[PDB]
Scaffold this active site. Structure first.
Site, PDB file in Angstrom:
ATOM      1  NE  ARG A 233      68.997  45.808  16.714  1.00 36.02           N
ATOM      2  CZ  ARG A 233      69.873  46.814  16.654  1.00 36.02           C
ATOM      3  NH1 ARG A 233      71.181  46.610  16.468  1.00 36.02           N
ATOM      4  NH2 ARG A 233      69.404  48.055  16.776  1.00 36.02           N
TER       5      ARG A 233
ATOM      6  CB  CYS B  28      56.408  30.054   0.153  1.00 38.43           C
ATOM      7  SG  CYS B  28      56.397  29.643  -1.605  1.00 38.43           S
TER       8      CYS B  28
ATOM      9  CG  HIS C 285      54.684  10.936   3.091  1.00 30.54           C
ATOM     10  ND1 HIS C 285      54.418  10.993   1.783  1.00 30.54           N
ATOM     11  CD2 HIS C 285      53.964   9.879   3.624  1.00 30.54           C
ATOM     12  CE1 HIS C 285      53.575  10.034   1.504  1.00 30.54           C
ATOM     13  NE2 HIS C 285      53.306   9.367   2.620  1.00 30.54           N
TER      14      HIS C 285
ATOM     15  NE  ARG D  32      56.618  34.732  -1.694  1.00 35.62           N
ATOM     16  CZ  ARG D  32      56.056  34.181  -2.769  1.00 35.62           C
ATOM     17  NH1 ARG D  32      54.945  34.683  -3.280  1.00 35.62           N
ATOM     18  NH2 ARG D  32      56.652  33.150  -3.373  1.00 35.62           N
ATOM     19  CB  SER D  33      52.961  32.932  -1.269  1.00 41.06           C
ATOM     20  OG  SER D  33      52.003  32.396  -2.164  1.00 41.06           O
TER      21      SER D  33
ATOM     22  CG  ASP E 216      49.099  24.931  -1.957  1.00 41.54           C
ATOM     23  OD1 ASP E 216      48.115  24.438  -1.436  1.00 41.54           O
ATOM     24  OD2 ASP E 216      49.549  24.476  -2.997  1.00 41.54           O
TER      25      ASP E 216
ATOM     26  CB  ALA F 103      49.288  25.054  -8.944  1.00 41.82           C
TER      27      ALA F 103
ATOM     28  CD1 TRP G 209      62.159  20.958  -2.143  1.00 40.88           C
ATOM     29  CD2 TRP G 209      61.509  22.630  -3.552  1.00 40.88           C
ATOM     30  NE1 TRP G 209      61.705  21.957  -1.428  1.00 40.88           N
ATOM     31  CE2 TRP G 209      61.303  22.964  -2.211  1.00 40.88           C
ATOM     32  CE3 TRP G 209      61.174  23.501  -4.591  1.00 40.88           C
ATOM     33  CZ2 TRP G 209      60.761  24.195  -1.884  1.00 40.88           C
ATOM     34  CZ3 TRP G 209      60.628  24.734  -4.257  1.00 40.88           C
ATOM     35  CH2 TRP G 209      60.427  25.075  -2.913  1.00 40.88           C
TER      36      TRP G 209
ATOM     37  CE1 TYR H  32      61.986  29.317   1.492  1.00 36.27           C
ATOM     38  CE2 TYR H  32      62.264  27.605  -0.207  1.00 36.27           C
ATOM     39  CZ  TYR H  32      61.485  28.559   0.422  1.00 36.27           C
ATOM     40  OH  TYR H  32      60.175  28.728   0.028  1.00 36.27           O
TER      41      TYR H  32
ATOM     42  CD  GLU I 139      61.401  21.512   2.394  1.00 37.39           C
ATOM     43  OE1 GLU I 139      60.724  21.488   3.421  1.00 37.39           O
ATOM     44  OE2 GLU I 139      61.034  22.124   1.399  1.00 37.39           O
TER      45      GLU I 139
ATOM     46  CG  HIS J 177      46.802  30.886  -2.050  1.00 33.67           C
ATOM     47  ND1 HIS J 177      47.830  31.695  -1.781  1.00 33.67           N
ATOM     48  CD2 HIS J 177      47.294  29.780  -2.688  1.00 33.67           C
ATOM     49  CE1 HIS J 177      48.913  31.116  -2.237  1.00 33.67           C
ATOM     50  NE2 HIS J 177      48.582  29.972  -2.780  1.00 33.67           N
ATOM     51  CG  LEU J 178      41.671  25.867   0.183  1.00 29.49           C
ATOM     52  CD1 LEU J 178      42.841  25.317   0.939  1.00 29.49           C
ATOM     53  CD2 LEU J 178      40.658  26.343   1.203  1.00 29.49           C
TER      54      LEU J 178
HETATM   55  C1  LIG Z   1      51.594  25.841  -5.821  1.00 31.92           C
HETATM   56  C2  LIG Z   1      52.577  25.292  -4.887  1.00 31.92           C
HETATM   57  N1  LIG Z   1      52.146  24.844  -3.698  1.00 31.92           N
HETATM   58  C3  LIG Z   1      53.007  24.376  -2.782  1.00 31.92           C
HETATM   59  O1  LIG Z   1      52.550  24.121  -1.517  1.00 31.92           O
HETATM   60  C4  LIG Z   1      54.355  24.192  -3.101  1.00 31.92           C
HETATM   61  C5  LIG Z   1      55.256  23.512  -2.251  1.00 31.92           C
HETATM   62  C6  LIG Z   1      56.608  23.356  -2.645  1.00 31.92           C
HETATM   63  C7  LIG Z   1      57.587  22.511  -1.896  1.00 31.92           C
HETATM   64  N2  LIG Z   1      57.096  21.841  -0.670  1.00 31.92           N
HETATM   65  C8  LIG Z   1      57.565  22.365   0.608  1.00 31.92           C
HETATM   66  C9  LIG Z   1      56.268  20.781  -0.686  1.00 31.92           C
HETATM   67  C10 LIG Z   1      55.564  20.337   0.418  1.00 31.92           C
HETATM   68  C11 LIG Z   1      54.645  19.356   0.118  1.00 31.92           C
HETATM   69  C12 LIG Z   1      54.621  19.031  -1.222  1.00 31.92           C
HETATM   70  C13 LIG Z   1      53.945  17.863  -1.745  1.00 31.92           C
HETATM   71  O2  LIG Z   1      53.988  17.628  -2.955  1.00 31.92           O
HETATM   72  N3  LIG Z   1      53.294  17.075  -0.896  1.00 31.92           N
HETATM   73  C14 LIG Z   1      52.701  15.778  -1.261  1.00 31.92           C
HETATM   74  C15 LIG Z   1      53.531  14.571  -0.843  1.00 31.92           C
HETATM   75  C16 LIG Z   1      54.989  14.434  -1.173  1.00 31.92           C
HETATM   76  C17 LIG Z   1      55.550  13.269  -0.365  1.00 31.92           C
HETATM   77  O3  LIG Z   1      55.350  12.115  -0.745  1.00 31.92           O
HETATM   78  O4  LIG Z   1      56.129  13.488   0.700  1.00 31.92           O
HETATM   79  C18 LIG Z   1      51.434  15.695  -0.415  1.00 31.92           C
HETATM   80  O5  LIG Z   1      51.460  16.116   0.750  1.00 31.92           O
HETATM   81  O6  LIG Z   1      50.424  15.198  -0.908  1.00 31.92           O
HETATM   82  S1  LIG Z   1      55.734  19.963  -2.093  1.00 31.92           S
HETATM   83  C19 LIG Z   1      57.034  23.913  -3.861  1.00 31.92           C
HETATM   84  C20 LIG Z   1      56.136  24.577  -4.702  1.00 31.92           C
HETATM   85  C21 LIG Z   1      54.786  24.707  -4.345  1.00 31.92           C
HETATM   86  N4  LIG Z   1      53.893  25.258  -5.196  1.00 31.92           N
HETATM   87  C1  LIG Z   2      62.149  51.338  16.065  1.00 33.51           C
HETATM   88  C2  LIG Z   2      61.844  52.480  15.079  1.00 33.51           C
HETATM   89  C3  LIG Z   2      60.390  52.610  14.661  1.00 33.51           C
HETATM   90  O1  LIG Z   2      60.106  53.242  13.640  1.00 33.51           O
HETATM   91  N1  LIG Z   2      59.430  51.999  15.457  1.00 33.51           N
HETATM   92  C4  LIG Z   2      59.685  51.412  16.683  1.00 33.51           C
HETATM   93  O2  LIG Z   2      58.764  51.065  17.420  1.00 33.51           O
HETATM   94  N2  LIG Z   2      61.032  51.245  17.013  1.00 33.51           N
HETATM   95  C5  LIG Z   2      61.474  50.987  18.386  1.00 33.51           C
HETATM   96  C6  LIG Z   2      61.525  49.514  18.731  1.00 33.51           C
HETATM   97  C7  LIG Z   2      62.485  49.443  19.923  1.00 33.51           C
HETATM   98  O3  LIG Z   2      61.806  49.974  21.060  1.00 33.51           O
HETATM   99  C8  LIG Z   2      63.565  50.448  19.441  1.00 33.51           C
HETATM  100  C9  LIG Z   2      64.624  49.868  18.509  1.00 33.51           C
HETATM  101  O4  LIG Z   2      65.504  49.054  19.332  1.00 33.51           O
HETATM  102  P1  LIG Z   2      65.923  47.585  18.947  1.00 33.51           P
HETATM  103  O5  LIG Z   2      66.730  47.609  17.714  1.00 33.51           O
HETATM  104  O6  LIG Z   2      64.694  46.821  18.751  1.00 33.51           O
HETATM  105  O7  LIG Z   2      66.689  47.001  20.070  1.00 33.51           O
HETATM  106  O8  LIG Z   2      62.846  51.449  18.653  1.00 33.51           O
HETATM  107  C1  LIG Z   3      55.765  27.955  -1.784  1.00 32.26           C
HETATM  108  C2  LIG Z   3      56.838  27.049  -1.139  1.00 32.26           C
HETATM  109  C3  LIG Z   3      56.489  26.473   0.221  1.00 32.26           C
HETATM  110  O1  LIG Z   3      57.364  26.000   0.948  1.00 32.26           O
HETATM  111  N1  LIG Z   3      55.154  26.455   0.600  1.00 32.26           N
HETATM  112  C4  LIG Z   3      54.127  27.144  -0.014  1.00 32.26           C
HETATM  113  O2  LIG Z   3      53.028  27.230   0.531  1.00 32.26           O
HETATM  114  N2  LIG Z   3      54.389  27.679  -1.272  1.00 32.26           N
HETATM  115  C5  LIG Z   3      53.301  27.921  -2.227  1.00 32.26           C
HETATM  116  C6  LIG Z   3      52.745  29.332  -2.196  1.00 32.26           C
HETATM  117  C7  LIG Z   3      52.109  29.519  -3.570  1.00 32.26           C
HETATM  118  O3  LIG Z   3      50.883  28.764  -3.665  1.00 32.26           O
HETATM  119  C8  LIG Z   3      53.188  28.836  -4.423  1.00 32.26           C
HETATM  120  C9  LIG Z   3      54.368  29.713  -4.729  1.00 32.26           C
HETATM  121  O4  LIG Z   3      53.952  30.624  -5.784  1.00 32.26           O
HETATM  122  P1  LIG Z   3      54.144  32.184  -5.793  1.00 32.26           P
HETATM  123  O5  LIG Z   3      55.567  32.505  -5.867  1.00 32.26           O
HETATM  124  O6  LIG Z   3      53.495  32.734  -4.596  1.00 32.26           O
HETATM  125  O7  LIG Z   3      53.450  32.722  -6.969  1.00 32.26           O
HETATM  126  O8  LIG Z   3      53.684  27.733  -3.618  1.00 32.26           O
END
Ligand SMILES: Cc1nc(=O)c2cc(CN(C)c3ccc(C(=O)N[C@@H](CCC(=O)O)C(=O)O)s3)ccc2[nH]1
Ligand SMILES: *c1cc(=O)[nH]c(=O)n1[C@H]1C[C@H](O)[C@@H](COP(=O)(O)O)O1
Ligand SMILES: *c1cc(=O)[nH]c(=O)n1[C@H]1C[C@H](O)[C@@H](COP(=O)(O)O)O1
Ligand SMILES: Cc1nc(=O)c2cc(CN(C)c3ccc(C(=O)N[C@@H](CCC(=O)O)C(=O)O)s3)ccc2[nH]1
Lengths: 264, 264
Positions: A127, A146, A51, A166-167, A169, A263, A80, A94, A58, A207-208
């Site tokens: 930077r 995430c 969608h 970092r995480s 789904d 979840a 959300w 965010y 968002e 992950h799935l």
């Molecule tokens: C476990 C977990 N997984 C997620 O991917 C996740 C995502 C968000 C927020 N987010 C960024 C979302 C993206 C997609 C979502 C969702 O529910 N999708 C439904 C449709 C919703 C709609 O109608 O648009 C889907 O795609 O089936 S929710 C928050 C917590 C989460 N927690």
């Molecule tokens: C920063 C310090 C480190 O531990 N490792 C690295 O490779 N660097 C390098 C990256 C770049 O060449 C320079 C930092 O400059 P800038 O901030 O990226 O412009 O040191």
């Molecule tokens: C978080 C929010 C987003 O926009 N998209 C995502 O993929 N997620 C997922 C990651 C994970 O499955 C869960 C967040 O849980 P946790 O904090 O990693 O434990 O939502």
């Protein structure tokens, strides 16, 4: 899309069963990177219907610096709802970190206009970063970021972006998170008179969920369709000035939608 | 190492010329990932002799929360000299953010104690992260964090770590930064009674300075050799208690060192 479905197969082929915070269980890998050339087409998943309306709202919400779901509710977006408190608040997630990261000496940094100014005045900077991972406010957030950290880069008149998620789904959040950042890259590039380059996605715990296995194999049996095209109909005076109606997706012919439980 | 030389060649074949902040010039690429399985051997580059003493004292300087080069000098490590002020301070760089991230309200988060407690009490967590990218203190730092953000992961009794390095000097900084985090993974794993897993490196702007072309060509002529093995001689009672004397590298047979100017 080819990259996305290869990631799903990869989690299935080498994921390790892991227990998790929600108690659902995941199949997990750690460490992955994929690249989408935004000039090939807009990266919106076609093997199931996504969608776009929810994705755009968002992103406009994040850019406004908002963390309360009322806006999303005015626009019929309920993605959300489950993490919001009784007031509709998600805490300093965010939007707040992007637009008003608090410093220890009483200032707030607006990382989005800082990035825009860097791309205009110093595009070779190494930077050009926006971080949502604010260690001191993690405890006030309904869910930790995430998609946590992203960096822009300019080469040969094209804007690229790399996100560290970092995480992830893979079934539910990742289709949305890829489209969202590709949209942000088109808006930044339009504001800076740049062309779009690559969106690079890097993942931590990818992950799935155990209860998404059937819908994953169902989706994995489908052929990707041609990627849709994004048309922006207006160049606003600022990146905080876009509205839902400025965007037009063309040529999106997806496969049927597939429903899956989130979840919590 | 195969992967390291492979990246080195990729920057030469693919890099774009960039004027950088030092007026030297770089060839760079954006977005790269590399994976090191720590079971196969410690990733210290063998095609040039690296100095492990400097690597160890810098990491131990980081875990003590110190940002003043006085300690490095006490151990005759000169690597940060060109960035410190008249008093030897670099400002609130790596060490300060890892051990005492300042909250907006005056408190401090020790991200290393948090991570130790998460690996011991909640190893399935998808939030086991250390960030040195403190947006509100960047302006106080002599140089912004290169290795900016990292995440730990545990699966099947093994500890993995992914680093996001936003800026990377392939020839000088990267051999050093890779060994540094491999070492930290070995120390965390020992303190948490885990086995070592993978060290995943992800780079943002990854570059080779124009004045390192000759020694990059020299280095690319050499055959990589078997990786050394690391031995930690003593098990300290906390991760803040290691000392230089506790680490031994064994089987390290490198090619001769290669001297090259640093860009300041
Ligand atoms: C476990 C977990 N997984 C997620 O991917 C996740 C995502 C968000 C927020 N987010 C960024 C979302 C993206 C997609 C979502 C969702 O529910 N999708 C439904 C449709 C919703 C709609 O109608 O648009 C889907 O795609 O089936 S929710 C928050 C917590 C989460 N927690
Ligand atoms: C920063 C310090 C480190 O531990 N490792 C690295 O490779 N660097 C390098 C990256 C770049 O060449 C320079 C930092 O400059 P800038 O901030 O990226 O412009 O040191
Ligand atoms: C978080 C929010 C987003 O926009 N998209 C995502 O993929 N997620 C997922 C990651 C994970 O499955 C869960 C967040 O849980 P946790 O904090 O990693 O434990 O939502
Ligand atoms: C442009 C730039 N490139 C860097 O790689 C860099 C690295 C640091 C700090 N750092 C992370 C260092 C690691 C290695 C260094 C170095 O000069 N190494 C030489 C000799 C020193 C030694 O290890 O004994 C070498 O490896 O031969 S410096 C600070 C600023 C930087 N600036």
């Amino acid at each position: 899309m080819k990259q996305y479905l290869e990631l799903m197969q990869k989690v299935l082929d080498e994921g390790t069963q892991k227990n998790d915070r929600t108690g659902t269980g995941t199949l997990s890998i750690f460490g992955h990177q994929m690249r989408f050339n935004l000039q090939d087409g807009f990266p919106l998943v076609t093997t199931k219907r996504c969608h776009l309306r929810s994705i755009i709202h968002e992103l406009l919400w994040f850019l406004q610096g908002d963390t309360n779901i009322a806006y999303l509710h005015e626009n019929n977006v309920t993605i959300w709802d489950e993490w919001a408190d009784e007031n509709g608040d998600l805490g300093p997630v965010y939007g707040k970190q992007w637009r008003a990261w608090p410093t220890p000496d009483g200032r707030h940094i607006d990382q989005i206009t800082t990035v825009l100014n860097q791309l205009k005045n110093d595009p070779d900077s190494r930077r050009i970063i926006v971080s949502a991972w604010n260690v001191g406010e993690l405890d006030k957030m309904a869910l930790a970021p995430c998609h946590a950290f992203f960096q822009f880069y300019v080469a040969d008149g094209k804007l690229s972006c790399q996100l560290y998620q970092r995480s992830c789904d893979v079934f539910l959040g990742l289709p949305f998170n890829i489209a969202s950042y590709a949209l942000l890259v088109h808006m930044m590039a339009q504001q800076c008179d740049l062309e779009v380059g690559d969106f690079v996605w890097t993942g931590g715990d990818t992950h799935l969920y155990s209860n998404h296995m059937d819908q994953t194999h169902l989706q994995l049996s489908r052929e990707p369709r041609p990627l849709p095209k994004l048309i922006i109909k207006r160049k606003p005076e600022s990146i905080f000035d876009y509205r839902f109606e400025d965007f037009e997706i063309e040529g999106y012919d997806p496969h049927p939608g597939i429903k899956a439980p989130v979840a919590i």
